[PDB]
Amino acid sequence: SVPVYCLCRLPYDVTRFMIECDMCQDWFHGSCVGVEEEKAADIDLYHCPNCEVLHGPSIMKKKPVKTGSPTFVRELRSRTFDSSDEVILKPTGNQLTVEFLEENSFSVPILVLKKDGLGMTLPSPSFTVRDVEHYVGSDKEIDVIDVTRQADCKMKLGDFVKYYYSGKREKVLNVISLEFSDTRLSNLVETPKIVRKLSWVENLWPEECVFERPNVQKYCLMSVRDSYTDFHIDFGGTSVWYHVLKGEKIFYLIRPTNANLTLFECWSSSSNQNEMFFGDQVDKCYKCSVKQGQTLFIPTGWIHAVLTPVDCLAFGGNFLHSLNIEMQLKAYEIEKRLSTADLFRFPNFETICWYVGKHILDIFRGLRENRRHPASYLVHGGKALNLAFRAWTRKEALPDHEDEIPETVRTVQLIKDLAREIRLVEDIFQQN
């Protein structure tokens, strides 16, 4: 059951520019309806050829800088931001423990200056993109971002490498989607210990289970000078570990307050999106520099953009965890409302949530049996998760969700037992 769009009735293709018709609510390829990317901006409310004859032409708007343009990057480099030093935590590798994260529910970015203590396995700083080719494969196809166009393209890793070491770059290309978990490069990399300890998939995804294991923990980032990735929330509301092996990366971090999340969603569905810097709309946009050998950890829901000031090679990944389950679910709902294609969503997000629910149940019961109670964040998360469980299993909604429910899970019993456990803890928390 694959959805199709446009006049051509084809399944989604992330390499082609698409716009939505307000009347239809269907999406159309720019080339299929004669709308070039450069002129799309002038359109506020687009009317497709059909809707046009039946309900009038498109609504036009009304110089503006285009996000990702060389002019945009220069202006960004000169913008004044808030100092991330006033909010980001700087534990040492050995101080970054689960207990440390629990103190504040891993609610703010964390920057670790030296890998020592991070339990991270990586090749030496002398590793080159050319070495990535040798380990990944010259003929492998990868998603590459044409920064000037803020569009995704597909090419052979080998082709990208040629462009990289090329004595000329007429285009600003950036590779940020190369997940190498199933290549030999995977043998030379181990994600930070803290990531593997918190990761839902790492700890709760069973062997086989009829669903393919989500692999989003090992990505290789190869970005040329001036590459720019616009503001976003990583898929599934995952947290991010980011290690700069060579070069430097600049992050623009915005806290996921209810106001900023609303502002973000409005911005993500605007007709102006590519003509406005989202950073100008929030009260605080923190600029964080991550240099060679340093590792940045981005919390759940944090909105961020990324500038590459110099050629850079980096490793990073995404992971879901239990410190802010409600925020992960919020990110998930935002993706749905924005009609996000699956390749930009956490794979089998709901399935892993069910396994987590079962696990959280055992923890609650386990803690109660050992005369102990769970941390408050777990209760809040367990509750928001149980609410989602109920929403996904309601008579009228079940058809769109049953498919992701593991066979080894009794939804009714899980939901009831979790509600019981949570409620108990809430009573005890009320004593004090």
Partner: peptide, 14 residues
């Protein structure tokens, strides 16, 4: 105009 953003980190999805 309302356009789908593609300059993001992909997961392969489906």
């Amino acid at each position: 105009a309302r356009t789908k953003q593609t300059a993001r980190k992909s997961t392969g999805g489906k």
